[PDB]
Each structure stands twice: as structure tokens, then as C-alpha cells.
Amino acid sequence: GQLNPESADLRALAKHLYDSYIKSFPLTKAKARAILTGKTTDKSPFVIYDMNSLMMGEDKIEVAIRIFQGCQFRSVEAVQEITEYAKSIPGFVNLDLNDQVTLLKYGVHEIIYTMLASLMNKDGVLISEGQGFMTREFLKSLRKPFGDFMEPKFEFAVKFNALELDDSDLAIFIAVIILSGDRPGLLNVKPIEDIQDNLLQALELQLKLNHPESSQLFAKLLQKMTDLRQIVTEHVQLLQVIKKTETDMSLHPLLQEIYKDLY
């Protein structure tokens, strides 16, 4: 590596994306980690870890289809923020509009799961705008099919969070996800790969500068896209599990509202 005009341009791109990311996403990874590690004394979340504490937290808060309808509605803001971020990626708004929509309609789910990992640690997930913390084992204990909804996302998040990415890293990673030339139905793949090539160069440099501890972090991070893609693909099978579940699927109303905060 040398400090030359192209490397400076890649640093300017990384900065541009970081600044846009801060402007687009009010809830950053740093803010979420500060809550999770016990430093946002302004907002100490209530811990929901069993049915008893679930009822004690009442003031702070088909069934499964209604959950999905509700979490999709609550994710509209995230979709809008991700779309606003995408407009800042140099070259993106010059693409064929159909390709912009295609890139976003596939990319937003992978990006939402990436951002969900910031809200998670091995014990649980922030909910209710950081005012609450829902434990992983309590979610896992819930009757089928609900108890299986979130555990694969926790498994992913622990592995993903072990990379110790910060918001500057994530800004470039999210842009790389958006500019994926492999999305089905794309009309003009080459201009998308031209931008992604630039973003990948910027990510590779960002990770080398920012993570001296982690020699193949670029490759490990790109491999995390396989897990993101698996989780997204599986959501179609959650829908089939629900159709075929002959059992009772009632769920405490407050648990229904907590699930609407998830994805």
C-alpha cells in the first residue's frame, strides 16, 4: 500500500459515506453499544427475561402474520433511511431507476439484519427504542413457532459482532451490500459493479487502516453476507412453518408488541 491519489480518493469516499451514514441513521452502532455496555445512564433499559418480568414491564412497552405485518410497518422508517443513504452513494442515482429499486428491495433486508446485530449481544436484544432489553433465552423458550424466529439472528449477530466493526466500517459495508450486481432482474449490471468495485476498494483500505489486529477481516466480513442471505431466504420458510403449524399460536399481547420491534 502507498499513500497516492487513488488511496486518498478512497479515504475521501469513506468519509463521504460515513458523514452520510451519520446523517441518515440516527441510531448508530456506537449509541447501541453504549446502551448495551452500561454507559447511557440517560436510558437504562428494563430487562424482560421471563413471563413475570414481561408483565412488570407492561407500561414500558393469525398472530405471526400480524407480527410480520407490524414489524414491516415499523421498518418503513429504516427502509426510508436506507434509501436516503443509497442516494449519497456516488453514482447510485445515475443508475436506471428500475435498477435502483431492485438493488434496494433486495438490499434493505440484509441491511436491516446488519443493523439489528448492533442491537444484540449474546444475552438479548434492545427493544422499545432502547428502553427495553429482551433476553435471547426468553425468546428461545417461547412456544413454536415463535421460539425459533430469532435464535438464528442471534447466532449470526454474535459471529458478526465478533468482528468489532465500528460505524465508519459499517457505512462502507452497507454501501457494498446495496451495490450488489447479483440481484435478480437487474438491467445494467456493469455500472453497478463499477460502483461496487470502488466501494470494495474503499472497504478493503478502511479495514486495513482500522483493524491491525485482523488480517483477513475483509474476506471474513464479505463471508458474513452468506449468513445475511441465508437469514433473508429463510424468512420465506418461516411463513410456510406458520401455515403448517396445526397447534395453538396464541401469544401474550406484550410479546406480540415486542416481536413487532424485531425482524
Binding site: 414491516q72 427502509v79 434509501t83 431507476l97 429499486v101 434496494l104 428491495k105 434493505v108
Partner: peptide, 14 residues
């Protein structure tokens, strides 16, 4: 939904 999601994205790109 997919059609609902596409419409959200299209409006947001406006």
C-alpha cells in the same frame, strides 16, 4: 410486502 416495499422505496427515491 414486495409490492408495498417497492412502493415505499420508489416514493423514498422521489
Amino acid at each position: 410486502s414486495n409490492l408495498g416495499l417497492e412502493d415505499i422505496i420508489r416514493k423514498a427515491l422521489m
